């Protein structure tokens, strides 16, 4: 084991710990592929929980500045000022691949401006916040997963992140409330009759069914475009990228099956992860 392989090993584990949902999925990648995908996603989420976990924006910026290091200057040697072992792990990766660093620029960009957790007027600024924390995701991942650097690769890959983060939405309604987060548009909401709190005390109804369902069939719409469009990723990824597709329709299915609960986070087994991936790796 070599310190760069630490660095690595400290990106997977932010990784499994906070995608307990896909993790699974883009571990099945090939080495020099699963460890990229792991070194972006744990500077993704460093970004996404820096002012939670430090209660201010002080990571936040040196992780900004740490990123423009590595952009202006990939092959220097940089005192890392925010997590030296995410950051060494990316600027390998950037000394080998293609970055969008503007992505990761809109999601610094979007955590800071969520940072009270502030309710979305209309759902196009929820899609918006979408883009921000996940589309971006998909944008810098997408050399990793493809060889196509052309803008409907970015597209699909803008596309599944996004629709991902719907996913954790959808999932997480209970959660997020206990947190003091609402992600439906208040727009929604009020088309709906529905207001968050009332359901987290007094359960789920016909009108909460119909908002979740509602954002449900956005997101498996989406799904299926991404589907459709499976062949923009590499060989190697596409049987990944079908597998993290599929988790994503059965954690909608789990949720259906508890009844739409705000009292529990379901989940799909590990052992039900590998059954729908043999389904699928059979066909390719």
């Known amino acids: 084991m070599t310190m760069m392989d630490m660095n690595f090993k400290y990106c997977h584990k932010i990784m499994?710990?906070?995608?307990?949902?896909?993790?699974?999925?883009?571990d099945l990648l090939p080495e020099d592929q699963r460890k990229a995908v792991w070194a972006i996603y744990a500077v993704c989420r460093k970004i996404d929980d820096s002012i939670d976990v430090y209660?201010?924006?002080q990571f936040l910026n040196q992780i900004k500045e740490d990123i423009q290091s590595i952009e202006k200057y990939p092959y220097e040697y940089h005192h890392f000022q925010s997590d030296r072992r995410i950051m060494m792990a990316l600027q390998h990766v950037a000394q080998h691949k293609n970055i969008a660093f503007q992505s990761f620029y809109n999601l610094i960009d979007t955590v800071y401006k969520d940072q009270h957790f502030t309710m979305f007027e209309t759902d196009a600024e929820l899609f918006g916040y979408c883009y921000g924390?996940?589309?971006?995701?998909?944008?810098?991942?997408?050399?990793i997963l493809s060889?196509?650097?052309?803008?409907?690769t970015y597209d699909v890959a803008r596309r599944l992140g996004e629709s991902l983060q719907l996913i954790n939405i959808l999932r997480d309604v209970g959660e997020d409330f206990e947190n003091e987060r609402?992600?439906?548009?208040?727009q929604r909401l009020k088309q709906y009759e529905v207001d968050i709190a009332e359901v987290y005390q007094n359960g789920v109804n016909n009108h909460y069914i119909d908002l979740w369902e509602y954002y449900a069939a956005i997101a498996e719409?989406?799904?299926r475009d991404v589907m459709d469009q499976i062949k923009v990723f590499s060989i190697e990824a596409q049987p990944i990228i079908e597998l993290a597709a599929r988790i994503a329709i059965e954690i909608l299915d789990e949720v259906r099956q508890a009844n739409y609960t705000l009292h529990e986070?379901?989940?799909?087994?590990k052992r039900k992860?590998?059954?729908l991936f043999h389904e699928i790796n059979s066909k390719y």
Not at 16 to 26: L, P, R, T, V
Not at 147 to 152: G, P, V
Not at 182 to 186: A, G, H, N, P
């Open 182 to 186: 609402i992600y439906f548009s208040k």
């Open 265 to 269: 986070r379901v989940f799909v087994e």
């Open 16 to 26: 499994k710990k906070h995608s307990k949902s896909f993790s699974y999925a883009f």
């Open 273 to 275: 992860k590998a059954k």
């Open 147 to 152: 060889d196509h650097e052309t803008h409907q």
């Open 133 to 143: 924390v996940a589309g971006t995701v998909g944008e810098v991942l997408t050399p």
């Open 55 to 57: 209660g201010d924006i």
């Open 221 to 223: 719409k989406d799904f």
